[PDB]
Structure formats: C-alpha cells, structure tokens
Amino acid sequence: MKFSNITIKNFRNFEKVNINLDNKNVIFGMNDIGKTNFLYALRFLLDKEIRKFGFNKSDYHKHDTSKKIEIILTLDLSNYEKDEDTKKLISVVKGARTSANADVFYIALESKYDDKELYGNIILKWGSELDNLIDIPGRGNINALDNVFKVIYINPKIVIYLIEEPEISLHRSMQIALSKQLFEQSTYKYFFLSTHSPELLYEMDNTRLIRVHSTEKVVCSSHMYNVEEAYGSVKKKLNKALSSALFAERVLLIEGPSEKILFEKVLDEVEPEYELNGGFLLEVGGTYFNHYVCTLNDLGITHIIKTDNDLKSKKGKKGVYELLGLNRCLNLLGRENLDEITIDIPEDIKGKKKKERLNERKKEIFKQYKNEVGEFLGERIYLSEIDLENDLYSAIGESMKRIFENEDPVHYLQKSKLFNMVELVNNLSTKDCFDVFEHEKFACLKELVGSDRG
Amino acid sequence: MKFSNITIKNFRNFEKVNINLDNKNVIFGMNDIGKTNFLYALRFLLDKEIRKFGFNKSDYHKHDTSKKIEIILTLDLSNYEKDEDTKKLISVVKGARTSANADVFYIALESKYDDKELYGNIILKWGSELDNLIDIPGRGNINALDNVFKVIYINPKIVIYLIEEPEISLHRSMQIALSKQLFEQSTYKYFFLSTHSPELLYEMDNTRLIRVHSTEKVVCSSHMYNVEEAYGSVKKKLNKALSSALFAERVLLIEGPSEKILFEKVLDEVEPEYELNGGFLLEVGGTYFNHYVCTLNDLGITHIIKTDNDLKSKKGKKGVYELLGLNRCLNLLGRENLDEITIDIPEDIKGKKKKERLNERKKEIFKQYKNEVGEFLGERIYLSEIDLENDLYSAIGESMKRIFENEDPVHYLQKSKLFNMVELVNNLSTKDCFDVFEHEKFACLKELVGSDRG
Amino acid sequence: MKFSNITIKNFRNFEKVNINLDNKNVIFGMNDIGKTNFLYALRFLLDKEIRKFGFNKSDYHKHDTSKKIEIILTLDLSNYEKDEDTKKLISVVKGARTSANADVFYIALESKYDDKELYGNIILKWGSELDNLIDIPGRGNINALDNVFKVIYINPKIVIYLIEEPEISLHRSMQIALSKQLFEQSTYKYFFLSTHSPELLYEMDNTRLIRVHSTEKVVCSSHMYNVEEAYGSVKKKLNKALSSALFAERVLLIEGPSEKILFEKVLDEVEPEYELNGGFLLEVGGTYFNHYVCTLNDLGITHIIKTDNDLKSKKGKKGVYELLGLNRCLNLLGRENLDEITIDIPEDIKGKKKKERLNERKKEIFKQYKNEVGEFLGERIYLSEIDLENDLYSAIGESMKRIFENEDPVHYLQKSKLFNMVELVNNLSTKDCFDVFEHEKFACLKELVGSDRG
Amino acid sequence: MKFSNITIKNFRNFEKVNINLDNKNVIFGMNDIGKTNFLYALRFLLDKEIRKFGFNKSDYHKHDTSKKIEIILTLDLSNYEKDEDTKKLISVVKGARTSANADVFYIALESKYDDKELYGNIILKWGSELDNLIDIPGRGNINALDNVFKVIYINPKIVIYLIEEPEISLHRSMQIALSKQLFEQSTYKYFFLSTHSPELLYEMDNTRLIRVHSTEKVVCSSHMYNVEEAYGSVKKKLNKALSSALFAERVLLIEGPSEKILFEKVLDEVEPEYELNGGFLLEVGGTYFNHYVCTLNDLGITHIIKTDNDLKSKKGKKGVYELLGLNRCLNLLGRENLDEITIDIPEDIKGKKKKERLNERKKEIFKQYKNEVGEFLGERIYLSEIDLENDLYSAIGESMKRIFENEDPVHYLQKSKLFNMVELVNNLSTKDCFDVFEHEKFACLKELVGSDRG
C-alpha cells in the first residue's frame, strides 16, 4: 500500500486542495494554521477520538457556506503479492473491489449540513471507484475502518504517526538524532511531520516534501524527494545546505566562501534585510545544480544561480578542456553536454601567459554561445564571461587599484582567494558597495532581494 | 549601573555557584533545569509575585540539608556621568550609602528554615558592604526595593526582562528579527535570555554569554563577548558560524569546503554519529583564530585547530613572503609576529618549479621552528608541513594514483579544489577512510571525536 | 407512553437490580453513589454524549468479573387515545412493531468485553419482545433512537429531565417553589430527581418514589405515590409531615404535641442521639393511618404506631359511640369497621362520673377484643386501654402525686393538656424517664430506638 | 478574650456596617453575596493567604469611589487572670497597651488607593485605643499578628474556624450531628458559620445570630441567643420550632395543630403561595411567648400572635383561676402578672352550664381590660374573647350548623379537637374560606400574608 493523494473539499481554510502524498510525508511553511488543519483533517478521516465529536459550526470554510465537507484518500491497492499490509487491507474490505484487477482504493468522508440540530454527522464510505461507493458497516461505536488503521498523535493494524512540532525545548543534537530515527528506521513506515527546524531534515530521503505557501489562502506544493546513487558520497553537505534553504523564499546559489564574504559585505552595506525577508545564500560547489533546482522548483521556491565560465582540464590528457560552467547550465535547461575543445599552446612561461590565453578562449566561447547565454538569462541563471573577480574589477576596479598597490588587482586576489578578499572587504566603503549592487553583472543580487520601489 | 555577578549560596539545584554578569546576559546549555532555576532565582530576588508565596520544602538543595538560602547581587553603583539610573538608585536607598566614595553595592536575600511551620520567610537587605547590611523597610505588602526595579517575564523604575525560550513555534526569520531587536535596540537595556536556537544569536555583541555544562551538577562559565573594530566588516559570517558552534562540546576549526567534504566523507564512513555526541566542524577562513578561541575557551568548549603552513606574498613587493601560518598559531600562544623572509627565485617558469621551491622553503621553515611546533601540539593546534593535500598523499596516495590517471595526483587535485575533491570522494571506499582516520597527520579528527584508545 | 421499569443487569455497583418506574420518578436515600450511578445508567441508555465515550474498565460491577452489561427499559407502548407520543414513537420504530396488538416495547443496551483493546462498544437494540430484538439502524454518528428522545441534565421529540441535587446553595422558599413547579406544571412530564431536601417534596402527587437503602449493596424500593380525593383538604399537612419522615429509618406515629413534649423529654434523658441514628417522631391527628403506613411499608421504612382507645360520639344522636381507636387499627389490618355500640347513661352529673363510666366501658371493650389487640401487637401497633395519661400514671404515678398537689393527677393533667404537661416535664428527673422507658406500656419507644437487649 | 464587634467601613458591598459579635457566630439570610463577602472580610483581616494578594479594583464599594478600606475588630482585652488566651495575646503585643488597666483592644486594617500602580497595599495596625494606633512589626513575609491567630477555612495560637455551607450533599442526620458538634463540643471555641439548612440549628445556645436582610443593600441584625434554665426541659422542641422560623419573613405564632389545620386549609383556598413569599406558621404551646418574640424582634423578623383568653385553675385550691391569656400578653408588653381571681360556683351539674359561666366571666374580663387589649392590638398581638371556635362560629356559623347536625356546632367542635376539625375542613368550600379571611377577628392571617400590593 502507498498513499497517493488526499483531497479536502471543505475544511477550516481548505477550498479545493489536492496534495500528492507518499509514505513519509513532511509539511512545512509559514502558515501554521494550515499545517495544523491539515493534521486535523487527517485526524478527522482516520482517528475515532476526533471523529466521535462530529463537526462544529466553526469547522466549515465560511461559517455558513458550502455545507458539504468531503475528505477523500487514495491508496493504490495494487501491490506485490508478498506484502502484508495490502492483503490485510483487502481481507477486511470484502464487497469493496468488485473486480480483482482493481488498482485504486478510496476512503471517503462525507458530512451533513451544520444547520440541522447544530451537528455534523460524519459519514464514512469505501469503494474501489469514485462513483458507486458503499458504506462502512459498524455494529456500534466502532467502524470496520478502525480495524485496519491505528493513528498515534505526538505533541510535546496499519499504524500512521502524526508528529507535530517535536523540536520544542529540544537541543539540536537530539533533533539530528530524531531526524536519523525518522528517515532511517523502519518503525516509522507511515508518518506525517510538521516542523520549523532545519536540523530535523539533515537526514532525509525517499520522502514527500509539502510546502505551505505564505499566503492566507492555503496553497500546497508537493515534491517527491530522492537522492540518487551518484550523490551518495556528498549527501550530508547537500542535505545540510538544502534544509535551511527549504525555509526560505528566495535562494541564491553561489560557489564558495569568498563570494559569500563579498555578498554579505555588500548586502550589509546596502540592505541589512530587517525590513525584507532576507533570503538565503546557498553554497554549491563541486556538483551540478539539477538536484537543488528541481527540489526548489517543485516546492515553489525561486532559485537564482550565479556561476563562472570555467574550463576544466581533462585527467590524464594534454591540451583538452571541458566546458563545465556552460555544461551545468545546459543540463539545467535540459540539453546534453557539449563536446570537448582542444587547445594547443607552446610552453614558453606557464605561469601568467597561460591564464591570459585561457581567458581569451573563454571570451570567444562566450561570444560563440550568446544565444544560449540569453536563454540562461531567460531563467535566473547568470554565467560570468571569465570569473567573478573580473566582474568585480569591471565594477569597482578603481577602489581595487587604490587598496592594492599592484598595477593589476585581479591576480593579487586570485593568488590568495580567502585572505585577500577579507583585505578588500576591510577597506571597503558604502559608496562602492552600491556600485557593486547597481552594476549589470550583479543582477543576481537584485533578484535575490526582489525589492519593490512602491 | 552594571550588573557584575550574582552568588546563589543555596537553592534547589545550586550549591555555591558564582556567575559573573553584565547587562544583556544570555544563558544556554544542556541542563534545562539549571537554566529554569537560574531564572527562578532571579525572580525570587527581584519579583514580588514570586516572593509573596515564599519558599517551599522543594526550594532547597537537598530537601532538608543546609537550610540557609542566600542570593546576593552585586551592582557597582557609583559612576560620575554615565547614567541617570545610578541617581535614581541613590535617591531611594539613602540610608546605608550616603558618601559617593562607595563604588560597590549589594542586594541580599536570606531565608529562614522550613523545618517548623512550613514556611521560608524570605528577608531582603541592602548595604554597600557585605558585612553590616541593613533591612529593606516596607510599611505593608510593598518593599522599598520594589520602587526601584520592575521585572517583566516572557514565556510563550529600572526594567529587567526575562525571556524564556522565545523560539517555540517560531519561524527562523522571526528569530533573526528578534535577535536584531534584542541586541541592537535600546529598549532591552537589561535582560536575561535562555534559548536553544542559534538563529537568535546571529546578531550578538556587548553581551555576557553563560554556558551551563552538561553535568547534573551545575557548572557555569561566563564570557564577556565583544567584536572589535577590526572584524566589523566580517562580523555577520563570523557570528553565523560561531552561533552553531556555541551549542557543541567539541569544535574542529577548518579552512574551507574541501576540508569539510573530505572530513564528512571520512566521518560518515567511520563514525556517522559525530553530530549526535557533540562534534562540530567550523569553517574559519580569512581571519585569525584568536576571536573564536578565546570565546570557546572561556565558555569551556574544547577547540581543535587544523591549519596549513602558508606563505603569503606582500602587495607591491617582490621576493618577500609572510610566515602567516606560523603567525596565527603564535598569536594563539600570545606571541608577537615573526619577521618576513626573503626568497630569491629566478625567472625560469612560474607554474610548477616555483611551487616546488616554495614547498622546499616550507620544509626548511618547518624544520627550523620544531620547538614552537611541539608547543602547538601541546595545545590542540595542528600545523601541516606544506598542505593538507600532501598529508592526504602521505595517507592514501596509492589510492589517489589508482583513481587519477595522472602520475602526480597532488598537482591535479590542486588545479581544481572543489570539483576534483568530489571526484576523489566519489571513488572512495571504506578502507581509505580508515587509513585517513588512523594516520598520525590526522589526529585532529580523533580529538574531534574524543575517543581515546588508552 | 408510561415508563414501567428499568433492569440494570451489570453496572458499577448494580448486580441484578430491577426498579419499577413511572413518569415523575424521585430517588433518595443514604447511598449517594447508587443514586449518581442510577442517573449515569439512564444517561448511558438514552444520551449520546455519554454513549460516544463508551465504557471503561471501571464501568463494571467487579472490575473484571461478569463482563456483560445489559440495561433494558420497558415502555408499555400501546394506548388508543391517551397521547400523541405513542404515535411519534410508532412512526420511527416501524420495523419490529407493525401490528397495534403489541402493548409492551423494549429498548435494550448491550456491551462487549473490555478485556482486549480497552473499549466497551455499547450496542443498542429495540424490539417489542425480549427475544428476537433487532438492531437500531444509524447511518453515521447518530442512531434512530436519538430522533425520538432528548435528554436534558441539570446540575448546580420526547424530553426526559434529569435533575441532580438542585437544593445546593438554595433558600428553602425556592425549594418549595421548585417542588410546586416540578409536581404541578406540565413542562416536566418525564423526569428523574435526586435530592436530600424535604422541602422539595412539600407538593408531591402522582409520582414514583424510589428509596435507596443504607447498605453498600444497592437495594431499591419503589412506591407509586398518590393522594386520593378524601385527603384533598388536608393534603399539605400529610405531605409536610411525611416528607421529613421519608428520610428516616424508624418512624413513630403519635397523635399531638403533648406526646411529642413527653417523648422528647424522655428521649433527651435516655438517648439524646435518636435523630442521629435514624429516628423520627411523626404527628398524625384527625385522619386514618393507612396513607402513611402503605407509603412507609412499600419504601422499606419501619413504622411504629402508638394510639389510644377512643370513643367517638356521633352528631345529632344521643347515646351511640364509635370504636374509632379499634377501627383505625382494624383498617390497618385490612378489616371492615366494627358496628356502633350504645351506652345508656342517666342524667346525674356530666363532669366526672361520665368519664368514669366511659373508662369502664373502654376497659370492657379492651377485654372483649384481646385477640385483635394481640394481632395488633404482632405488627408494630400499640393501642392503650383508655389513654396515655393513665399509662403515665401506671408508670410514674407517685412522682405525679408528688409534683401536683391534687390527689388525682390524671384529671388535673387532662384539664389542660399542653400547659400541665410542660409543668410535669419541668419537675421531672432522670429516674422518672428511665421508669417510663423501661415500662411495658411504652415499648413503642424501644422499637423507635431499635436497641434490643436479647 | 471575646469578640465584640467588627466595623467594615469600605468593602465590595459594605458601606458603614457595624455587626456586634460574640464567640460562636452564625450568619444567615437571603443575600448570599453579603454572607460570602462577610467571610472574605474576615479572611482579609486575619488570613495571610488572602492578604498576600492585596486588594483589586473590584473589591472596593463602588469600583472607584471612596478608596479607603477600613476593617476594625474589637476584642475585650479585660478578662480573668487564669485565662490563657488573654495572656498569650498580651505577651505578643508589647508596646500596645500603654496602661495596664486597658480593657479594649483593636486590630485595624487600612488600605491605600488603587488608582496608581493597581495595588491595594493592606496595612495592619494594633493599639488599645482608636486614636494613636501603631504598626504591627514584621521582619519579612510574616507579621506579628500571624503569631497569635490561626484561621482554618472549610468549604465542601488562637484558632478561628470559618465554615461556609456545610450541608451540601449532606443527609440531614449528619447535619444534626454537625450542629451538636458545633454548639456542644469545646473544639470550636471561635467560629463563624454560614448556612441555609435549619437542621444545623437544632442544637444552638450561647451563640450570636446574624441575619442578613433581603435587600441588595447589606443590612445586618445581631442577637445574642441564650436559653435560660426555665426552658431547659423543653429546649429541643423550642429549637426545632424556631430554627425553621428563623428563615422566614413573617411568622404567625399559633397554639396547636387544629389551628394549623384550619388556617392552612384557609390559606390553600386563598393564598396558596404564602410560604413561598416568606410566611411561616409556628406552633407555640405550654410556654410563654417572650423567648420567641425577643429572638425574632432582635433579628428583624415580624411576629404575629393569635391567642385565646384562657382561665387556668390553680393546684390545691378550689374556685381560683389564673388569667393566663392576659398574663402572656402582659409579659410581652413588659408588665407584671395580674392577681388571681375567685369564682364561686355551686355543684349542680358541671357538664355544660359551668363552661357557660366561665365564658361569661371571660366576656366580662375582656370588657374590664379593653384598654390593655387595645395596647395588645397596637402591636401584632390578637387575643380572642373566649376561644377560636367561637370566632369561627361568629364567622361561618351557618356552614357549621349545616354540616354538624347539632343545633350548637361549637360544643361538637370542642368535644373532639382534631377529628371534628378535619370533618369541618373536608366539608368546606371556597366561599366560606374567604369569609374567614375577610373577618375582623382573623386579621392575623392578613398580617401573615402582608403583601404590599397597594
């Protein structure tokens, strides 16, 4: 058995929502009322201790309008022959599946109007098809649906867990321990989890991620999160980086710590983001962008990428290079990897002349694929012509020639990436941070901020 | 007026504790009962709503032993021009202090025995000296101490705020907003704050940090946290890095993301629960170590440093280099910076021979200062001879020659730091990570784990 | 429809109890737990707010023994023209009862075992006969039984009221007002009432009185209380006298205030705690005893009768007298009244000789009917030979000659019944009251106390 | 020590009340809020658990007007030298009584305004005189007044009990037991008791009775209730009669059960809700009226008396009679008893003519003392000329001649008091009950009803 989707037609703030499901569902977002009402909708469907009180006047969409509450759950009855849960579900629902080739099962919840005697009268029905459902029989206080499912609710037979906000008064090491227990152990086969803590998502895999949007109207996006076998050795940094970005509205994907130093200085001088959200800065280095981009795109989070046009030399060869920075953006657009170029160079001196020759090659590569660069710019993908250091020289190069006594200030900062960046940031003023922010090669910061003039 | 220290001579789980204070005090740690009882001790000293109920039997260290509760607060009254709160404390407390030469002031709490009549009878006294205190006069239900101080308690006249766990059911952007309001606005002049969330400490300055140790016996370490004017341009990254490290037991200070990739691969193969038991990896890049080390040392957190012997060339000068990797560790040991050396290198080729000459000079430098290196190993400071890549080649170099078709994998892995390290991690087995973990040049990982063979 | 009886086959202190019912049921007694659980048994039968929680482990007679709870209510459904409630019960319960020849109708409750899964699972069934009951159909949270009956519970569709202890913090005039509203108004057609206050019973008629016995085992006696049209002009005195006697264990029925004054003096000298242990003195004068005796006998209260052999003259006729004192006891034994006698007395003097002739006639009538006197003594009926004053002279006559200067104290004490008896009580000692108490003509006091020597 | 009075000068419904006190105080009445606030005023004076919360805004007289709450208690410090409670009070109040001849002690409560800081600040002071009170010294949370007194509050050192409504869910035999314990045992030396049940007053003596009047404005009447040694043998009957009359507004004092039969039939035909509005019929026989009348007069209950002009013969002498009916009313007005009169009557036949001669003597006696009869009529005292059956014959005598076959229906009613009055009441209509009610010899019933319709 595998939960597929739940449709809630009328509830406290749900109107016609459909949320795709899996086993191991996780819900998060700004709307705490929507997450609480999602868990209470599950409790009304599958827990008798909540269902026995019926529906009140307050638990309709408007308080006297659209008096038909429907909650329907899809179950995917077709499975393997050897699993116990499918057969133990089928053995209770006898007259349900009229055909033995039935693949989909439905558990429905109907409600009467609240005007009659100030009561709701929840009525439950199964059936293997949406039309022609039949009633769930029960002799007394107990339904036949209660014989199959058990619901355990946590707040500080087939078993479904509902964990609400377990990080309250909890140290972060115990949150990481609970994350490992939730997503690795076989005890929690079916659960629904709501949280605000990114430390509960450091170990996460084969889970359905549900994001509830910031609006008062409940909007839900669902993504089926898997980590494939290629990223198994870099899974921990990937999950630790992405878990804090899941709680953001706007995420800028950058390479390393020196870009974070520069962008945090520029943002602290321009907009300290006490008025704004203050979206996330995400460090992505050594991998491709497709995993983060599909995860954030299916969840409704806007993704901004600034990258450099790198030329990676091949291993064990001479004079051949890969178009890695172009290939990552082409993989983002869904294209295939380009062929490798061959660069023939004399020896001469190999210190400083080779970087100039490679920079000229990067310039003419940037000239060749300008249409693909415009297609990257159609999305929020920003590919530098050579490197971000050259863009910084094109923005604030007079200040860089003032601070650094060398005739060129680029190579002095390339020769020590982290240490010289702090020296430039220390001697950096308010005027030229705005010069960086207003430049046309730093529009990624403008998209990350997302400012409105008024 | 500035709070200096509070001494609690007998209370429900305190024995003889003495905690130094400031304005803007922050308390954190594993022992939640100790933090709650610290806030209750402050409420018993300064809040009449807690004093009017008196002391029970349970408000004692052992439930009958050493029945004399003393809570004494030191104030350091006399300033000349600093504030108006000193004068409004003088004008009410005219009795014991008359001369302006008295600089130190005391507010003392005493309790009677609970053996007979089942009551505590909290008695309060002021006085400018520890001997010869005099009673606080009060005509009815109200003391004269209540005219000076006001206490506001938050849980989800001179004014003192007591905020207990404000991050409960709170999104992390609002935690950052509350941190900025707590440590930048002038509304919260005096407060005591307890928290589990690192997002409430992204903006912190001029504050007293109190750490409560993991033991059942209450041990408190207090540090006066300031950020000086040199680190003002890198303050936000530094605070964001240090706030998560404040909630750990063992912290390893590393340089950048390549070290993090390699070390989390090695740790995930060897001990995948290092974050559960209190380990943390801290990226420190572009600054000196002393600001992190003094903060972690005064709070009782063990600090481990893994660094490389770098040569830093100056700006505008040719042939002179800085012994910066030695200089950071010498600054950690409280010593002055070494003088700059001169290296004479001919024209030749600048690519590969220059690196070999610099590595040879680093080997001679490492041989010259071996006594200082042994003193660095006396503390938890680990300085490599050349680089981490050479130590990795000394550990798993046959594996690196197997993965990489180049005969020298050190140069190939140093051409692209981030992408080639992910490639090495991808084709890495369980046998290689134990070879890295058991090597003598990677004892920092053993100190971070904390396991001792003998 | 008229409530007939309820049988509770297993409940938290009921074993096989069977209580006859009517409309307007009143329950009282020492066992407060039994009254509370009687009202809870009614709530478990007829209220969905109590049924929806089911049965616990504590809702059983012994906590594991005889796990089959049955609560069955009989209704005597079929009338021809009496009310409209019968037709509105037929119209919903069309299934089991179709013919109009079925006069008796049943509402049955059954419960499952609480051994496994910790639930009771109350199951309800109707049917016009005890065998072959059928289930009550209900589509959702609501039964078809809930459509007919409504239950309103008071504690400081056919409607049943359940009033529990309404006299709490209530002035006694409002208790009499609630009594008049409960037993005269047509709003409370069906109710069950529990009380400790006799002021709630000053207006009672056409009601079923249920007494719960003082034992821990629940014993219930039911009496159908009516006041006939003969006692309609003295109804308020019978109700006010009997309401306080309903809360007693032993009741002595006396004539007037002289007997009460003498017996309260004697009891205050001998056993001053007769009211604490359950004794009561009831004044009955001018009526027959049968209305009190049948009510007290059906409720399990022991009744003791002390009376005098009076001769009652008729109106308008001379020389004919009625044997009223014999006739009341003969009516108590279910026998017809004796025929009138004729006494021939000459003119003579009418003051003192006439009383002696009447006393001699009373002595010879007492000699004639000694077998009937012995049968009265078989029950708790005590008939004096002439008068109580002669028995007092036969007990303490020397004391009466000492107090009163007249040689015959019987005539003097009979000239003024109230003022001379107070004079005899005033000059009375402890020795005289024990002489009255131990005399053979005052065994009614020994039966009222209840102490038996052997 | 003995409590004398408590003055409450501003409280939540008290304005300037003075209530005289003794030991063993009992408070009752319609105003439940006034009794509850009287007990709260005692708790605010003498209980630290109520003083430590202070005064709110609501517990002032109006919600802002006359913000000066004063509660003062008087104690009678003069006592015998062997008394312990006086000595243990004096040993704590050291500087209180400036003279050793001080007889009166004061315990005073004062309050501050609640306009600022929203606090009451209860301040307590002793002193042996109303001017020049001094503060109660207390070092911490505890006053010196708390060392002397202990307060125990009951709701379903010198020790004061406060029992509020103990008859709730209590059987009446336990109420009589608690009454005997409260008023006979020496455990409850000091108490204040509030009740609604007359069964808690069956044993009562040496107590202060406080009645709270039916108005919303708190009016309190206090009476010192004692039973003298003359009524010690009729004490139980007297207390059982008076306890139910203490909860009434208008009380008619009648002789025996025949008058109760007649008057309660007449009231059931005329004013069926006489007891609902505060009427009560009290049987007084064989005693004088003064003990009931002084108790009801000091408590503010209106007393109505209907009595007959009886002639009682004297022991041991022939022909002398007492004017008992005149003497009881003269004792009510505070006059001495009249001398006995002598009637010389020959032997003749003493059946019927003797009663006629005695009735003629009663008529001329009624003619002699007509001025005293008018003075009795000035109060609510009604004395018949001969007897009540003669007034009944003067009212409805035609009906009595219709029912009774005798030409003289008075003597047929006199020869059997109880059975013939029931026979008259049985054959009694609505018309002649209004004839009894409207007659000028039955104005006591009109005063008993007493409805000011206008």
Swiss-Prot record, chains A, B, C, D:
Name this protein carries in UniProt: Endonuclease GajA
Cofactor: Mg(2+); Mn(2+)
Source organism per UniProt: Bacillus cereus (strain VD045)
Superkingdom as given in the UniProt entry: Bacteria
Positions bearing the site annotation: Interaction with GajB: 94, 97
UniProt GO BP: defense response to virus
Domain notes: The N-terminal ATPase-like domain seems to have lost ATPase activity, but may still bind nucleotides. The C-terminal Toprim (topoisomerase/primase) domain probably has the endonuclease activity, but when expressed alone (residues 348-578) has not activity, showing it requires the N-terminal ATPase-like domain for function.
Database matches in InterPro entries: AAA_GajA/Old/RecF-like (IPR041685), Bact_Antivir_Def_Nuclease (IPR051396), P-loop_NTPase (IPR027417), TOPRIM_OLD (IPR034139)
EC number(s) on file: 3.1.-.-
Temperature dependence per UniProt: Optimum temperature is 37-42 degrees Celsius.
Lineage: Bacteria, Bacillati, Bacillota, Bacilli, Bacillales
Consequence of gene loss (knockout): When this gene is missing the Gabija type I system does not confer resistance to SpBeta in B.subtilis.
GO molecular function: endonuclease activity; metal ion binding
Function per UniProt: Component of antiviral defense system Gabija type I, composed of GajA and GajB. Has no detected ATPase activity. Expression of Gabija type I in B.subtilis (strain BEST7003) confers resistance to phages phi105, phi29, rho14, SpBeta and SBSphiC. Expression of Gabija type I in E.coli B (strain ATCC 11303) confers resistance to phage T7.
Documented activity regulation: Endonuclease activity inhibited by all NTPs, dNTPs, NDPs (at 0.5 mM, UDP not tested) and AMP-PNP; not inhibited by any tested NMP, dNMP or nucleoside. Inhibited by 100 mM NaCl, 100 mM KCl, 0.5 mM Co(2+) and 0.5 mM Ni(2+).
Top-tier EC class: hydrolase
Residue positions binding a divalent metal cation 2: 259, 389
